[PDB]
Symmetry: C3
Subunit: 103 residues, 3 copies
């Protein structure tokens, strides 16, 4: 719907940007730039945190009537956010491995 629909687009874009930043963070690690990787990861998380917070309000205050479940719309947003958050967390682990290797 109006906002919910426009809000989802923002969430999808935000989630996509989060992943983009995360992959970029990893790329920095490959170049041996741990400092930039850490900075990129930190920002990536903040983007996700804000996105997750918005989704939480939706999931909690969404359902007009009773039930708390979710909606077709929310599920789509959750899919992007869940994927992005997971990607970012795993990417963080991958970056840590690069540090252990040396570079």
């Amino acid at each position: 719907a109006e906002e919910l629909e426009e809000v989802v687009m923002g969430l999808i874009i935000n989630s996509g940007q989060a992943r983009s930043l995360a992959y970029a963070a990893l790329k920095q690690a490959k170049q041996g730039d741990f400092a930039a990787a850490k900075a990129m990861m930190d920002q990536s998380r903040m983007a996700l945190n804000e996105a997750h917070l918005v989704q939480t309000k939706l999931i909690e205050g969404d359902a007009g009537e009773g039930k708390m479940k979710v909606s077709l719309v929310l599920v789509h947003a959750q899919l992007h956010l869940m994927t992005s958050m997971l990607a970012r967390e795993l990417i963080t682990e991958l970056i840590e491995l690069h540090e252990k290797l040396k570079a």
Copy 2:
């Protein structure tokens, strides 16, 4: 609905616990504890397997009328389970890498 709704909560919690155990398993690997990591991974999988089995019954025996597809509710459960299973599988790979590194 009654059970389905309560069942989903259990699945979501179970999926979340699965991931939690998986991340913890990885943490053990970082401490150089391959034995504990393996034990944690094994338990993580068992939790997922039981969760997946419940979802399968849902997906197969859910749809009251004809169609086998899924439902708004099932999709949400699948999202958590799919994310958790994938996370756990990737985490397993990450742990194996730690073993190859040494520690």
Copy 3:
């Protein structure tokens, strides 16, 4: 529905095959076969690309009436595709690490 339902099954199978190929690609890397890993990854991506293209047509040309959003059915397909694509991308990163790790 008829096609959409049958199309989803194809997408789910394709997504599953994509992941299967990706994991197999990783396995090749463990055996120290970077050439086979690369070949498997390339094919995995092509499978996903074709799958993603089909989903795009669905998401863009699906909704019979106005709205572009998604449908219960599409979300399910997106879940598998999103999971598979992410898995494959992360697996690619994991394979690159194996190459850096010698073998």
